[PDB]
Structures are given as C-alpha cells and as structure tokens.
Amino acid sequence: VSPKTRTSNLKNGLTIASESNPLVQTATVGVWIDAGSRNENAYNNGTAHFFEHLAFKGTDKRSQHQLELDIENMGGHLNAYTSRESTVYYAKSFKDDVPKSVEILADILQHSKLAESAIDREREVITRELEEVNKQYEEVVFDHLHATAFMNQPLGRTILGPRENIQTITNTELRKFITENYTADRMVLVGAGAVDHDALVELAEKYFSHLPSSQSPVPLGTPIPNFVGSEVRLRDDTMPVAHIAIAVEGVSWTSEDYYTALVAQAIIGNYDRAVGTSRHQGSRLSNIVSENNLANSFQSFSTSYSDTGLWGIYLTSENTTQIDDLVHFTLKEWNRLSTSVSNLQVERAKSQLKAGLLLSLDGTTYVAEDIGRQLTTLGRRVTPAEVEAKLEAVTEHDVRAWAQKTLYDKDIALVGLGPIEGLYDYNRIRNDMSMMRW
Amino acid sequence: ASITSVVKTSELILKSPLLSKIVVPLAKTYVKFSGYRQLGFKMNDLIIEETPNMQLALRRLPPTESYDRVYRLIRATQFSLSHKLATGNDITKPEEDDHYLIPYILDVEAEAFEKDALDNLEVV
Amino acid sequence: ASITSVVKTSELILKSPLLSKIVVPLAKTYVKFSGYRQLGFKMNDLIIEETPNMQLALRRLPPTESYDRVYRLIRATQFSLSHKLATGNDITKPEEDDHYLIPYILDVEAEAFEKDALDNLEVV
Amino acid sequence: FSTAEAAGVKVAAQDGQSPISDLSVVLRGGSRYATVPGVSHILEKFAFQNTVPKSALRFVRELELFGGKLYTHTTREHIVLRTQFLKQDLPYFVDAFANVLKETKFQQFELTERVAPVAELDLLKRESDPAFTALEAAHEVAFRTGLGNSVYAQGYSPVTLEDVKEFARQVYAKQNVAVVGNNVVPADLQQLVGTAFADLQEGSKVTQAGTTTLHGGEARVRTSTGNALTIALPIAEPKPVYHALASFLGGPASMPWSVGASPLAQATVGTHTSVKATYHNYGDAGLFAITIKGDSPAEISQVAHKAVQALKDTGAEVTEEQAARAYAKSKFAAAEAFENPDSSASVIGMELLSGVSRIAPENVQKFTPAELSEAAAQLSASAKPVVAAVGQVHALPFADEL
Amino acid sequence: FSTAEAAGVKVAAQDGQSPISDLSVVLRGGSRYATVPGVSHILEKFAFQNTVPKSALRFVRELELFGGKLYTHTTREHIVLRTQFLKQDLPYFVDAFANVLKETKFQQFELTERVAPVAELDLLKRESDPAFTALEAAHEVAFRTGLGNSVYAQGYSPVTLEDVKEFARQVYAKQNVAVVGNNVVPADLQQLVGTAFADLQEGSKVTQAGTTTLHGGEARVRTSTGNALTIALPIAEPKPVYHALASFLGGPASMPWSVGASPLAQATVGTHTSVKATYHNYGDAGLFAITIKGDSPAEISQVAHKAVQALKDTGAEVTEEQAARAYAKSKFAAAEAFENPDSSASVIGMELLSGVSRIAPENVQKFTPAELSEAAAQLSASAKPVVAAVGQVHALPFADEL
C-alpha cells in the first residue's frame, strides 16, 4: 500500500497534489496544465510548442545564461513537454533543492520575457525540427493517424504546427495563448518523492498566488470529434521496414468502457522479436506473428482524450511479401474479441493489468506524471483499491459487448509508411473487421 | 500417433515385469522380421518427417548425425531401386540401432503439448 | 519500331527545309489532338516499356527523373479511372514535355545494334 | 538496505511502502571475468531458459499471470537479473531464481535458436548509437583484456555451448551470488533465500585472468551509421574526485532547447554535436572518458579540440562557484543512481560481492576548487591518452592532433 | 629505353627481337594524388570504357581480332595501362590510348553497372590474402593521407561520377602522361605518339595535397579470411641500403619444400607461417615492412618476436658472407623487376614523370656489413613502430609487446 496522495487548493483555484516517499533523496516537482495544441486554432497552430521553447529563453529577471546557471547550481534538471491536451513543466531536484526549483517554474510560466530577438532565433530551430521529425517513424505514423482520424478537427492538427504559422507567430499571439489557457483552475502543482505537502502548499501560496482565474471555471478534464474512416499511404520503397498503424475510435478518460477497452487491448498485447520472452507470450496474435515471422514488433494502444480516443495497433515488419498476412491475422484476432473471448482470456488480461497499472509507477518522475495526468484528466488521483475494483468489474460479457459496438464491422483509420506495396486497399483491410462465418 | 505417446506406453510396459517378459521378445522378433536393418537403416530413419514438429527436430540434430542420416537414406534408396540388400558393414547391427532422434522429437513435442495446455489455462 | 529508327527518320525530315516546313506544323497539331498532355503525361511516358532494352533504359534514369515518372503514371491512372482531365498545373505545358528518356534508350539500342553487327563480322 | 547472510548467500533488502517489489540476483560474472569473449552476455541471455523444474514457456506464461516483468543486463563487473512483481508474489520469484541457478538445462537448440539471436539483436540495437561503439572501443584500447574484453557477444568470436556451460559452473555458485530486494521485507527474504538457495554449490570466487594493465593507443571503427569520438584517459588509482570532475565538465543540458553552462556543453556551441564526460570506477583501475557524438566529422573535430582545451583550463584553476556546481551535480547523480533499480542493484551488488561499502548520496564529498583543478591537471598530463573514432574515421581527429 | 619527347609527351622505347610488343601508358595518378578515396582505382577501371570514337564493346571485339591483351593496375604513385600485341599492330594501340585519354565519355551507367562492380571484385580478391590487408593497413597508419590513402575503392566511401570526371581532367593531360614501349621501334613510336597525342590538353602536374607525414601506431582489422601481422618502420630518408636489407632479411624459401637460410625464414621454423621483408621506396618517404601471415595467431606471435630480434641482431653484426648474399639477392631482385612488364613500365614511368634515373641491375650498390648494420640499427631504433594485426586481433601481438 502506497502512501495517500494529499490534495489542497489555493483561493485562485490552483490544485496542489503530492505523494511523499521517505526512501528517496530526490524529488520531482512540476506544473501539469490542462491545455495543449488542441486549444490553438488553425492560425496559431504551433503556439503551445513555440512557448515551450521560449519558456527556457530567459525571464523578466534572469537571462537565458542566468537561468542555465541557476538550474546547474541546484544540481538537477528541468524538463517540459507539450501534447494535444496536456502541457507539463517539471523540475527533478534534490530534497533540499525543491524550493528553488519551484521558484524557477513560477517565473518561467508567469513572467517569461518572450523577446522578439529570441522568437526569431527559435523560428529557425523549430523550422529545422519540422524537417527532422521524418526520422522518427513512429511519430510520423501517429501524427498522420490523428490527422486522418480527426480530419480537419483540432485533434487532427500537429503539435509543431504548419511552416506558415511558424513564420507568423508573434509575441502577441504567444501572450494571448498563455493568458487564456494557463489559468489557475486549469493547473495542478504536483510533488512526488521527498516533498512535504504542507511545504509545497506554502511555496504555492508564495509563487502561484497571483495567477489569473478563468471567467468560467469548469472542472478539470472537461472537453465534438467525428471520427473518419480513412487511410494515408506514405509509400517509400527505399525503407526496409514497413510501419503500419490501424485504429478505431476508442474511449475517453471518463468513459464507462475505459477499463473494458484496456482489458481488450491487453488481450492482444505487445510483441517484440528482440525480447527473449516474447516468443512465449499467451496472446494468440503474438504466437501467430512469432511462429510465422510476420513482424519485428507490434504494440496495442488505447489512447484517450477528454471526449474521444483511438484504440488500435502499431506494427513494424520487414516481411514485405506477407504484410497482407500480418494485417489479416491482426484483424482476425480483433474479430475474436467480439465472437470468441471467454473468461479465460479476460481473466488472464485482468491479472496482467492489475500489476501493470501499479508497475508503471517506478521512480519519482513516473509517480509525478501519474498524479498530474490523473488530476488533469479525471480531476482526482484514483486510489489503487478503486482501480482494482473497476478492473475486477470487467467481465467477458463486457469485453464482447464493447468489441461488438466498437470494433466489429467498424471503419478504421489506417496509416502505412515504407515498403507497403503489399498492404491491400482500404476495402480489403476494412472487410477483415468482420467474419462471414459469424 | 505422437512419439511421446509411443515412448510413454512403452515405458509403462517395460516397468511391468510380466508385461516386459512377454512383450520384449515379441518386439525383438518383430524388428528382425521387419528387415529395415537389412537396408542399413536405423529405426529412427523410418519415422515420418513431413510435419512441423519433425522438421524442427531434424534441424536440431548435431551436424554429424545429420550428415550420416542423409547418407543412410541415400544408401537405402540405392538398395531399394536395385532390389538388393545390404551386406557386411552396411547391415545395421543391433548395437548400432541407436535412438539418435527420439530425444530431439520428445523435446519438440513436450514444448508443443505444454503450449496447447497453457493456451487453455483458467485462472482460478 | 526502334526508338533509333524514329529519331533518325525525324532527323532526316528536320534537315530538309521543305519537309520540315510541312511536317513540323502537322506534328504539333497531332500532339495537340493526341491529348496526352491533358492527363499530365510527357510524351516519353507513353513509350512501351515491356522490353529488355526499355527496362534497361528505365533502370539508368537518374533517381529524381525516375520518381517523377512514377508519380505522373499514378496521377494519369487516377485521371483515367475517374474520367477526368488534368487542370491547372497538372496539364503538361509544351515546355515541360522534355525527352528525358530518349538519350538513355538511344544508348541502350546503340550498344544492342553494335553487338548484332559485330556478331556478324567477317575477318577480311 | 540491511545486509545479511542466508545459507551462505549474501542478501540485502530494504522494506518500503509500495505494492511493487524488485528482486535482483547480482552475479559476479560480468565481462571482466569472462573466459571466452561474449560468454557473460550469452550467460545473461540464457537466464530463464528451460530449467529442469520449469520450461521457459511455462515460466513466461506464469509471469504473465502475476503481471511480473523480467529485466536482465551484463556489465563489465556483473550480470544482473531483475524481476518486478507485486509484493505478495515474493516466494514464486525466489524459487524461479533458484531454478535458474541450480537447474538450467543448457541445450544446444536454445543457444542456436533463442539465446544467440537475441544476443545479436541486443548488440545491433546498442551499436545504432555510435557513441556506444566509441566508448566500448575506448575500453578495449585502454585495458586490452579484463575490463578491455567486449561486454557483448560478437559474430566474429562464437561462443559455444561448452563455453557457456563452463562459465555457468563457475558463476552460478554461492560465492558469486548476491540477492538484492527493493521493497521486500528483509526477514521474509532471508527465510526464503535460505530454503531455496541452500543446495546451490559453494564454488569459488571467479577471478580476472591476469592483472589489470593500462595501455594507450587508437581505435578507428569505420561505420556508415553516424560519427562519434571518445577521448578516454585510463586511471591507475580511481579517485572519487573524478566523479565531481565528470559532473563539472558535463556535456548535456539541464533544461530543454539549451546548451548548458558546463565547459563541455560550451564546446559544442555552433555545432549539432553532443558531449558527455563519464568516469568509470572499476576498483583496481578507472577510465575518464569524453564522448562527443555528432553528424558532421568536422564539427566533431572542432568540439574535440575545445574539449581538450576545457580539460586543460580546468586543470589551471576552477572557481568556488564551479566547485559548488560540481558537488551539487555529483550528489544528484549519486542519488538517481541509487534510485534507478538497474543501477541500485549493482551498487549494493558491489558492496555484497566485492566489499566496497556504498557511498550514500548524502555523504558525497565536497571537493574544493584546488582538488578539482588538481584532478583535471593529472588527466591533461596523462602518458596514455586513448582516442576512439567511429564513423568517417579519415575525417575524425587523431591522438597526436589532440 | 631511349627516352625522348613527342608532342610534349615523354616517350621511352626499347627495340627487341620478338613478335610481341608491350605498350604502356603510365599516368601520374596513383592513390597518393587521389582527390577523393578510391578515385585512382575507379579511374583505372574506367580505362577502355566508351569513348566518343569507339565503344568499349567495339574495342574489345577488335582487340580479340588482333589477339591483343589489356592489363591495368593502380599503385600509390601511378596508374598503369598496358597492352600486349603483335609488333605490327602498334598504330592501332597508340590510337586506342589516345581515344581513352582525350575522349572517354564518363557515363553514370558505366560507373554503376560496369566500373564500380569490377573495382569491388578486384578489392575482394586482393583482401582474400590477409597479408595484403595488413600491409595496406600499415601504410594507412604510417602516413595517414597521401601515401596513407587506400589504393583501392571501398564501399564505405563512394566515388561519384563527378569525382572521377574531375580527377581525369587533371590526370589525363600531357604533363602527367608517359608512354613506355617494350619491343617497340623507338622512332616509330615517337612519330605515332606525336600525331595521336598532339591534341591532348597540356594540363598541370598533379601534386599530393599536403606534405608526407610519418606516424606510428596500431591497426587491428578483425577479419576471418586468415591471420597476418605487419611490423612496419616508416623511413624519413629513403636509402638504397634498405633494398639489400630487405633481401638479406628475406623470409621466402629459395628452393621447393625448404625454409631458407635467411634470418626471417629461420624464424618460421617449427611453425606453418610465412614471412616477407619488403622495402617500399616512395621518393620522399620509405617503408620497411615485415609481414608474417599464417593459420595460428599464436604461431604468428612467436615468429613476430623472432622477427624483431632478427632485425636487432642485424643491427649488431652482419658477416661479410651475409653482406655478399644481400647484394646477390638484391641484384637479382632488381633484374627481375626490370624484366616483369608491370614493374618495368612503372620504373621507367618514374624516370620519365619524375626525374629519378633508374638504377640498372648491373649498377646496384654493394653495401658493406657495416652499412647493413647501420641500416638495421636505425630501424631497431625507430621512434615510430607501426603494427597492423589482421584476423583474430585479440590473439595477435601489439606494438608495445614487440
């Protein structure tokens, strides 16, 4: 039994959430924000990402050099990431270097200089990154997957944004974005590791008290996405490995089918030829794939957002003449989630998840990420007991019912990249989403 | 029938004193009248090999055993097409009729059968 | 007919003032009514490719020319199946209709024809 | 971590307040002790193959029912086999480790079909990073044998089943085995290890064939997969001041989209390269290395010259600020090393097997500017500098240029 | 060989009494002058490809009608293109060389389909011998660039059509071209070369980018083609005494099924290894090399230690008999080199292109025992010993050990 997550509020509406650990000597403190690239329009797309760059480019007081020195003097590191619906700015430091790291964060968030010269310097950096994301094949595949699944919708936009916007983002647009979105009722100050909650709340009162509140404070994790069955093919015969993702519309964080979708995802599971144990996994798809050498890897996913999600699989394969077999057998395993799954598969997957959901929370950063994610998406840290109960309530009937409404005979979003000549047209892939024998 | 089945049933018989006393002499005469040794075969050379399990066990043979098996098959094929029997050193002596393949196929089948059982496990 | 034949005969015509004066306008009208440019093709995209000589010339294309040819074939195939014509930038302009392939195939054929001649040489 | 002894096996455990336990077996069987090149990597990959009581297949299927995970790695000093599971499943995991150490059937087909292919993919994935290659080549030049043996199996030196069986006969023995339990009740572990590992051979301490000898030289590795350069300095007397020196010199950034205030980080300015100062304490010997990776070999050449200059500049004199930074960053490094289970296991493993009492992050020494500058001065004036170039080696610097 | 000049081209010919003539074009275009690695090898392989007057195909078909043959090779100093034919067919061969030098169409498809594949098979065949590899690696360590450039094209560094076209623009020019005719009437050659090579550009002398530098070190090449080791000693002052030294030291047997009386040959006794002392005069620098190839790395290690000892023993004392034997072996070596058409062409080529007058075999200097001892002592006291292990490099000696 892990220690209780303590939670307090300030007057402005800033949540402070902490989970202490006496064994560690190092503590992760950071700010989880319920805002991301989804909050941009098509004219400022890429602003959130641009700000992340400029947050570490100098503040009202300290310059970029001074900022660097200050963090180095603490001894720890600062890190940040922007997603579609969440922005995070954390600081891993020593036990005694927690107050100073908290001070640095409040400064970069509330009073960043955003100098015009610094903007111009970052423009080139971001422009370079736009023509360097190509290398990260998995990211390319998933960015195209969102773009096609949520065609012409805010969830379908890239985080980096288009080249055109990058050349036109001004300090005004930047300031407007962070003034509208980085409000106290949308922010959670999170501490994990060697933190005292009462100390953290005092530091929040000292640094984050003059944060604006939004005009209409909705609860944390408050959102209509209309999924498009569709495909993107990025054929490249010079690549040796094909990368293919297939997804259907999945479930949001607060769906009643949230855990049922995770159990279904665990029945298919992951596979990697480089891991020694993978040839012995219980998953039917894993056995088919390893015995026939159909793939280098596959990873099932169930990605959630506030009002939608994507559930599917990501495959990598060098077997270019049997891509058809790989996809065929994958979708036939999905069909079995609706037609054949019994207590056997379900209980096995639940057993695996019961551990996996706790196992994920390794170090202080992992714990802080969990607290922050849960606070910004659900509005609360769900206790392991509640999670164990929600998983226990998933039955074989629930999985079959969920699959029959979500997978069976449904439109898919499909992205292929690389030597995908062997990937059949949309109809033949989508026809595998049902079985004529059933 | 699986090699596993054959080996286990044979072991049940060899355990029983009565059974072994009556079965072992019959099995030895059977093998003499079978006459595979007169084509220079070992018993295991006759086992059906066109299954996934057997192809796996044959790939696991040590290279020397594998090369010698190839030669015995080619030599028996040449006796068969000529309508001749082995003579002299080509005849398999009872002491040379070793079960070189049985251990490999028993391991292949042990895994295959465990996989089938474990595919049907029920969390209690 | 060989590309060589076509190119040489055309060169005979272009030399003769009279002939060129009468043939070049007809050839230009022919090309306009042919209408391959309205599917975004270049003339050389239409040449029959299922020959050893042509497969060799296509392998010798610079990678850029080769990738662009692939795109123009796929794009024309999509116009054909949709019963649409190219519009705007997809239409091949006369200045874009370059003979990117002719030099490669003329070199392939020059070698092929020399080989045939030399296979029939007689020492004098 | 309460150190004890259970049936002749050293057991260290630290109870916690979490649902997840980590149990690690640390073996004195890393590559410095290897008998044949690559055998310690192959032995690591042979863990949790078929044992007499439990097949590899059955183990994996049962591990999935507990939702446990398995992690293994090889260093120059240890093989580490770690399992992560829910607290209550402890007896199963202790028994599984016992089966591996006492009853592994080392079958030829497992070596050919399972173990060696996985070892080969492991190495190819690591080598995708040219910095990994450069730092491995630097150890090979600097120490030749022992610490200079390759950590990983390579194709050019084939490990046989007899090699792995012999090495396992030495390594899988009470004298070479330490058990480390994170978030495990110490009294419960001692009782279980005491019953499970009672019939393990005693064996003898595996020793390094030959004394550690220090050499200098160059290693040019032509790859077509990116460029790196290590400037390593073998140390005969490994001092803890080199830890502070590495942390000071630095190389990486401590914030996103930044270079960093560290000397080596300020040597990459204007290029697309990355530097990393790394000290490797190895008991009898040590290695201080400055690894510079990048795309352009010319860019690497530039940074390499600035890197050597930075070390000389440090040797001249460092300020009180710089000294305080070194200590702060070194204490943080120690803290996170003792936190991460991968490295935690090996730290206590070294205390249990070897005898080197762990240095708590709170007991990391503060070095004065004098002591830091003296340490850097001792490195700039080394008689045996090692340079390992990887990639376009014709365009990368040589030792005599640096 | 009567040296003359015909239309700005240096022409050397020697008439004979045989039906067979050899005509060689020697080009100052060997690897020490190579703009990019491998370009001189690729240029050599591009000779007799398609020219504007005559396709590669037509040339080969006509060469067969004359029964002529074509030989080409690349050294560190030259590209040599040689043809062998009947005396009377001289004008055809002169014209074919002119077409190659003036009118080669350097087409991309020839590079991809014809030239580079042939260059790659050429190298793989040479590397089948690990002694070739060891001696190549030793030049690379000793000189780095220039003389340290690879002679042959390698896969890791691709030569482009633009590289080869640029280099040919420099090399195929009157200033870099020498014509050598064996069994060719000298007056007839001068008249033909004078008409055929009149319109060749004048160009300028190709030079080595940078001054030749001498270095020491190690080169461990892990192969499985066999095992070899070169003990190279770079010479800053090229002297003819090292020719007699190499001959004296020896290594190969003088008779079938023997070992040989030579010091190095008497270091292989008991083993199945083979040694060879070789001196490489390069005008501005030199390289003394002792290459030991064999099956067993342990055997090689033994011979390698005896090899360095033999050199030290020579430095101590050579007998008068040994000095006379060195003179005899060295005179014979000179004679056969001037006979072999490949080496003959390059010897006169050096005289014509540089100005280094050839040393006739009858004018080979006799070095006193004192002179030979001096030479070997200088090599034993070289401050830059180069070692190049090939094969199981872990089991082969290091520079420090020798």
UniProtKB/TrEMBL annotation, chain A:
UniProt-listed Enzyme Commission number(s): 3.4.24.64
Domain called Peptidase M16 N-terminal: residue spans: 16-163
Gene Ontology CC terms: mitochondrial processing peptidase complex; mitochondrion
GO biological process: protein processing involved in protein targeting to mitochondrion
Peptidase M16 C-terminal domain residues: 169-353
Role this protein plays: Catalytic subunit of the essential mitochondrial processing protease (MPP), which cleaves the mitochondrial sequence off newly imported precursors proteins. Preferentially, cleaves after an arginine at position P2.
Protein's recorded name: mitochondrial processing peptidase
